[PDB]
Design a protein around this nucleic acid. Sequence first.
RNA 1: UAGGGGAUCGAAGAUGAUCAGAUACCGUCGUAGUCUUAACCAUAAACUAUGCCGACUAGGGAUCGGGUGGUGUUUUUUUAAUGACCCACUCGGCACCUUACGAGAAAUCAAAGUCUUUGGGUUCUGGGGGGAGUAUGGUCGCAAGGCUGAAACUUAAAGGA
Lengths: 60, 87, 129, 216, 121, 206
Amino acid sequence: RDEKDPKRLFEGNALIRRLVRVGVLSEDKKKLDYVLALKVEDFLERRLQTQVYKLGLAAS
Amino acid sequence: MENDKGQLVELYVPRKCSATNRIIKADDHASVQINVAKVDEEGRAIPGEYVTYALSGYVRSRGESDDSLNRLAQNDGLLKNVWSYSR
Amino acid sequence: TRSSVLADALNAINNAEKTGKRQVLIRPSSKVIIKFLQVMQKHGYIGEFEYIDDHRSGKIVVQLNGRLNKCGVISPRFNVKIGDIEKWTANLLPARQFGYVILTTSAGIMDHEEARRKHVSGKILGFVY
Amino acid sequence: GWVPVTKLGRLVKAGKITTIEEIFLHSLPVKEFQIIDTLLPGLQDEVMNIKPVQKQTRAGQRTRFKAVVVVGDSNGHVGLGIKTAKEVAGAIRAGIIIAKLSVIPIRRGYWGTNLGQPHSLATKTTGKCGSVTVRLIPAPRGSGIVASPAVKKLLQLAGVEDVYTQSNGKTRTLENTLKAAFVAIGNTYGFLTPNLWAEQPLPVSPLDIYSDEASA
Amino acid sequence: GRVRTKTVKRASKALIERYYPKLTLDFQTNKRLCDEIATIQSKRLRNKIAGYTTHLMKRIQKGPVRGISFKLQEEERERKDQYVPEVKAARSNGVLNVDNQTSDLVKSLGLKLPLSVINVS
Amino acid sequence: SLPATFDLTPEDAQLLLAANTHLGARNVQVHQEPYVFNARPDGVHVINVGKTWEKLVLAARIIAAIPNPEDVVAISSRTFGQRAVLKFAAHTGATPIAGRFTPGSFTNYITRSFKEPRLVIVTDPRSDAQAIKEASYVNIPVIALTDLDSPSEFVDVAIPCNNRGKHSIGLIWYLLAREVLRLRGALVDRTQPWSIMPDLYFYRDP
RNA sequence: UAGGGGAUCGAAGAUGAUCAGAUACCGUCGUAGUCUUAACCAUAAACUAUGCCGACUAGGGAUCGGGUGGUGUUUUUUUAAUGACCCACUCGGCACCUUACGAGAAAUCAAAGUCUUUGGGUUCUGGGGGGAGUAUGGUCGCAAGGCUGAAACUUAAAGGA
């Protein structure tokens, strides 16, 4: 927005915590900022498809 | 130019003509930087100690420089006359 | 004619400075302009600047640094709402950081970042970098 | 063998100079090419376009094969040149060098939100050749490399990572296009933002600091 | 014609540098010599090198010929160099001539002028 | 720098009245010289007759700028000259360059008699047109020896005389030097004469 | 279109030349027109084949018009005075050189630059080649004609450097 304006924080702090719940981005990175450095490839590890693999119970 | 935590984050800081506080952008050739000099209290050239200053290319082309220095070592603290801020 | 003032002198100031003139002279003096420079100056972009009066609409010397990159007049003078400047910066400021767009309210013949601390907006004459 | 030539060559063989940022500070020339071989090894090549011409003789049509070559690493360092030649195997080759004397910094930096570790440019730049106009613009994070296959290419090698672009600009001219774009990034450095103004105070030139090694 | 060649000239012009001294014009004494020095193809080629040389030492003597010097002509230029004695000292007309408008700056600049000058076309 | 006698003494109206240096020219007074005493009703410009001791001897401290006078030359290509500029080259510093100037000799690394100076000079700025230009270049101050006749753009000071034949071209440098030397060098400080003539100084052969 | 003018050129017309033909080139004459008053027409390669406003980028040396300063060049008349001149500076031209950081298909361009990093203000125009700026209507003109402006049909190139 500025920084500090009601809307920006609220979403950020609601936005963020939606991604902390899905593991997507860390704890330690969430300033906001930063969620941007998230490429396709991070999401994929948090798909059940693969989280099984890692919890091995699956050959490949 | 710098980070959140005092880390100069750059390739370098550009050097800037000394009378013209533009920029000197890598591959200039035209490009000079002077090393006049000082006397010691005596017809003896003082060694390992000198002035500096730094011409763009910019102005080599325009006649300029001769009159730009003749502002500056009169304007600094060596020369007397030739030059006038009131033409 | 000369149909508009601020413009005329400004252009010569981005045509002094380009060539490395250390300064300028400009003719028709306004309040408008006096104010304009007084903004520019606060922000580190020129210095001093030594009105001269002659009982006339008058002449103004503006001593240089060689910093100025560029200060076009905008120019109908459009209108503007608060949350709208957020369109301008990025359509005529290289960055954001920096480098002030600049406008005319009520206070104020005063840029946008100061405008936040005031929360006001009207018409947007020149801009610096 | 290398071997050397000029005052500038000799120095870097010996290694009285270390980094490429010596050399753009005092802003030297560069004639020899090994001069940035020893230094930057990171360097990798890439071939953009191999086209035939032609200078048309009395019972025939002569040909060469413009290549055009781009070089660099990730860190703010581009290289660019264009050596026709005949047969490919001079034509690329002594393109690759053509580019290497033309290495040129860049001045990756911030969008806004300062944060930690440069991704985009510092500012808006433009370039012009004959027809093309390039308007690079700093974009926030991994937004992307918004442009033609080739521009992406240039701009990767030069990391840089993210930045909006736009053309004008006949960009079936792969050659006048790159010519241009290049002449803009090489020009980030050739643009006073407040954060420079703090007057730096001139070092001393290599050309008489290691004056003796520099000669027989 | 009779018009000389590179291989030849540029073989005598390289030679003439070192060997001006053994150096001659009886060319039949160079011919022999011009083998002990160059490592020449042929007999014909060789007889056309020295022909040229003798066209150098027959004009060298006559004077300063061009773009060729051999440590002997260049030391008669530090020997011919220098001259006029006395240097410039006016007595004879003493007062040194000083346009008569040559009194203002140097009345606004020194110490002693022994000057010459046009009371006013 | 006001001193004492560099000041006119008992002879500086006697010796240039037989040689003409107050004189100007025909129907010609060039906007580019304070460097014309009036201007008479019968012929001809009576060059101001007090200000050549103002910008022919700026013209002597400016150097004093040489650590090494053979750089302090004399520029030319005339006939009456090749016997005063050759010659300014002998009695002190300077390569003479009359006759061949040597074009470039100040443009451009590719020639013969090699130049890289910091105040050269220049007889006829109509004969010496390349200290005004070989200077409007890059960084080579110049000094024209500015008759009623000398494009003044870029030969930044005045050096007036008269050249319509006769002597004073050569016999005028003489004064650049004497008085450059009486700042720095080896001669002597009102007078104890000066051992040549202004009637060595003229021709060598017609 | 109607009066005046009608030297010279000179479509048209006649000619003699050349030529296989020559209604053209070459030559000599020649109304009309060129010229003017008063009234029409409104097209042009009306050409920088480059809309104007603006604002910003990189050097120069010329010139026209101003203006400012230099105990500046002559004018000499007694010193000035102006005036021409020289130079210094500038604002406004009319261009030019040189670079290319840029742009371009290129040739080249201080603007055709600041355009895939795509956006300062707004008016006209074009969307393959022809058919055709025709046929049509509608309209301005006395007429020549202009402005407006189709389609059917045909075609894999026409074109730029």
